[PDB]
Assembly symmetry: D2
Homo-oligomer: 140 residues x 4
């Protein structure tokens, strides 16, 4: 049961980094998470309009998780699939998968959840229209 | 329900680091995972006997996940709860929770899973006796 | 000539972390810099009064550098020497050295330079009295 | 005295990452160093032949330093200039500068030094011909 390129709507390429490999020769399992919210926020920055610097509205990570199938190593060229699952109105949930360039099978694959808040108060908010617009653009 | 200090068998203290705090003031959600397998492996190193540098046997992270309840920021003094859930014989599952010093409530809390393999072949193996001994030592 | 514990006025202990070790077994050369401004800012926070979250005044790193003498690896217990070299009035220069516990010889050793600015304008400022007080406290 | 695109021979583009920004909104000064040896080793991997996994021969960082001129922030598109200064025969010295895409002026700029060794012994060695070949290819 290993995810596939075509199950995902948006694709970020990310350059790997020397100190991505951990001591056993392969990208540390933690790094995948960094690849996630990079992948996400990049999309959010360029399309949702936020404005992190910036924004009166910001997303927060309340939970995440990831499953690892095959190893990847610097310097290889990883690239990140992205698609939205559930989606409340102060809240969302993404599905990420990392693919090696030219492979149908995901290398690992995971999910996490954003909760949008007012920056100052950290109190939940409706997803403003422009975010919601681009967010929805990734719904299955 | 937000986990509690006494539900956990082993305790690693970890110094937070300047660049732990992300752009919105608080320790990045990713860092938690770093705190996990630090917390784990540290115990593994000192009590399972491995031997990561030298070990013919090494652990791999095949999945992990985490839920976040309250924010923490450098320079505060986090400290990490640890306990084993399930436990096969080439395989294990930890349950981690991070605690601010002193608070009864976990700040976030998560789990992940080790698979022990022969370093060279990366083929699964029986948990050698010393590991299994200290691992089991954390069983509920 | 390899620096020595007694040449340094303040001492931060820092827990090493699993993914500190790079692919060749030893704490990545980059991590040292992380250890620096952790070591610094920690002292700054607790004794200069800033206040990074809240501070109208913040420090910026305009240059740094480091020389490496002996390797260190998670899980060993490094610990960080600190002292001030030069010291203008909107500007300062620290000298850091990392020590294995206990060794008289520094493992690596480096320096870097803070420039205090008004957070908003990022325009240079006089070091406010409390900072200057604790800063000077580390002058040779 | 701020470096210029045309003073450098090779150019790595590197994607920035969410947790590159530190607490004051801009890429942490430590990250530049990660950008350095990424930039380097990538070139070394694809052209010097090593083989880090791999190699009986590996490079080590004995010193580095960096000067910061202008700030950069995720998600902007940084990209790394690269050119060799000095060059012994067990030893080398690179000059790095980071450029924002479409700027003549470097954002920061730095140097560091490799020392090649036999992996196992960590004892110096002559730069094998293929490395030396591509290394030299970057001499002023």
């Amino acid at each position: 049961p290993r995810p596939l390129r075509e199950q995902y709507l948006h694709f970020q390429p990310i350059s790997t980094r020397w100190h991505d490999n951990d001591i056993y020769g392969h990208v540390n399992n933690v790094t995948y998470y960094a690849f996630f919210d990079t992948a996400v926020n990049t999309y959010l920055i360029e399309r949702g309009g936020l404005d992190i610097q910036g924004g009166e509205v910001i997303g927060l990570v309340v939970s995440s998780s990831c499953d690892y199938f095959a190893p990847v190593a610097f310097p290889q060229r990883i690239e990140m699939g992205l698609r939205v699952a559930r989606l409340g109105n102060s809240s969302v949930q993404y599905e990420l998968a990392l693919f090696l360039e030219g492979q149908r099978e995901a290398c690992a694959a995971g999910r996490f959840v954003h909760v949008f808040v007012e920056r100052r108060s950290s109190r939940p908010v409706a997803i403003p229209q422009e975010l919601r617009d681009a967010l929805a653009a990734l719904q299955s």
